[PDB]
Amino acid sequence: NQFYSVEVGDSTFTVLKRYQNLKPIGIVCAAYDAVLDRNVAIKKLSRPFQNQTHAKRAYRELVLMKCVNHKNIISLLNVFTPQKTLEEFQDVYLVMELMDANLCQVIQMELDHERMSYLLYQMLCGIKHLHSAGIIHRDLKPSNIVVKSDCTLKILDFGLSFMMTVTRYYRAPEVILGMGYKENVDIWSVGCIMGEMVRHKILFPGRDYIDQWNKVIEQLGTPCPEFMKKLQPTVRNYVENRPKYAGLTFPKLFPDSLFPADSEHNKLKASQARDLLSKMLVIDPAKRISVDDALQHPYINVWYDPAEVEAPPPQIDEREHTIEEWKELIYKEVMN
Numbered sequence: 025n026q027f028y029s030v031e032v033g034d035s036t037f038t039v040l041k042r043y044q045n046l047k048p049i050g051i052v053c054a055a056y057d058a059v060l061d062r063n064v065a066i067k068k069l070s071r072p073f074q075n076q077t078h079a080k081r082a083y084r085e086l087v088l089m090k091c092v093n094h095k096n097i098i099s100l101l102n103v104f105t106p107q108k109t110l111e112e113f114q115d116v117y118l119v120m121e122l123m124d125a126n127l128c129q130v131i132q133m134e135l136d137h138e139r140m141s142y143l144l145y146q147m148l149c150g151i152k153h154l155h156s157a158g159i160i161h162r163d164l165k166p167s168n169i170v171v172k173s174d175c176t177l178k179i180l181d182f183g184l185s186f187m188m189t190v191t192r193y194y195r196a197p198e199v200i201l202g203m204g205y206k207e208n209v210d211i212w213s214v215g216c217i218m219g220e221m222v223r224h225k226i227l228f229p230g231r232d233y234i235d236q237w238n239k240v241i242e243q244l245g246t247p248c249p250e251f252m253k254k255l256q257p258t259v260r261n262y263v264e265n266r267p268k269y270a271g272l273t274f275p276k277l278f279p280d281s282l283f284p285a286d287s288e289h290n291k292l293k294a295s296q297a298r299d300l301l302s303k304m305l306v307i308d309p310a311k312r313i314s315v316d317d318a319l320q321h322p323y324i325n326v327w328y329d330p331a332e333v334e335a336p337p338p339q340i341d342e343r344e345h346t347i348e349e350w351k352e353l354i355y356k357e358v359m360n
């Protein structure tokens with residue numbers, strides 16, 4: 025038999041013999057791959073076909089992980105199921121390179137500007153590749169971003185009904201207000217992350233989209249009139265009748281306190297980081313900086329490489345099925 029089973033905490037893992045000494049890291053395991061002779065991460069999807077939300081995402085993430093090729097987006101080293109037939113078909117295991125930590129953990133660190141900006145440079149390279157392929161993520165968050173000791177970074181998922189068992193802090197106002205979006209919907213999320221790196225607190229926490237929007241304008245202020253104009257009457261109504269805020273300026277929103285700023289170098293960088301933050305954390309997407317300009321930004325452009333920025337975009341969903349059709353679709357993919 026090519027497979028063996030072991031329990032991890034609450035779950036059974038039934039994987040190829042090459043993978044050993046599995047350890048829980050998220051449901052995901054780190055493991056040693058004897059064939060490649062390096063460590064990998066192994067994600068187990070149980071019955072991803074159990075419902076249309078799960079099924080769509082599992083399927084979508086499968087097609088993409090496999091035709092997208094860029095160092096800032098996760099790549100699959102291997103996909104398998106232990107089950108032998110479509111009828112027996114139950115689980116999917118995705119195998120990728122192992123890094124060292126989530127972005128949440130990095131975020132809890134005091135980071136120099138060289139690392140903070142390299143991280144952000146990479147997020148933007150990743151997001152830029154996605155967009156060139158027609159993929160607007162719309163749900164970048166730290167928990168789907170991973171980092172290696174050498175500061176290298178990968179985005180783990182490809183972004184956006186009901187389920188029976190999710191973080192929206194990082195979602196743009198155009199997503200929250202459900203209002204039509206373009207590529208720079210993702211700049212917003214990078215900005216919440218960047219902001220969170222600095223302030224070390226989640227920028228806009230909320231029990232739900234009401235809270236959340238309240239947290240947004242509490243600090244950035246009510247959006248201008250032109251922004252309201254692109255809101256549905258129903259949404260626009262509710263938004264124009266929310267209590268108003270002047271807004272705080274950015275030096276106030278991110279005081280000098282928060283910034284490495286003891287050398288001249290670090291003082292100039294602090295100024296540059298805050299300038300970029302102020303350009304990303306902008307409610308009106310018509311005024312928010314785009315991806316290309318953020319890569320051009322002095323804080324960011326020290327890392328700029330045409331190979332990483334301007335890479336061939338992937339050749340390539342948006343669909344609906346029953347449990348059984350989803351199951352065969354996924355099985356077909358897993359088998360090729």
Ligand SMILES: O=C1/C(=N\O)c2c(/C=C/c3ccccc3)cccc2N1Cc1cc(F)cc2c1OCOC2
Nearest residue numbers: 049050052065067118120121122123124125126170
């Ligand atoms: O590097 C990853 C990773 N995949 O590489 C990783 C994954 C991989 C997910 C995945 C998604 C789709 C396909 C294949 C794998 C999930 C969660 C964390 C990951 N981490 C962070 C991580 C690495 C460790 F070696 C140890 C820990 C780490 O984080 C928490 O603390 C313990």
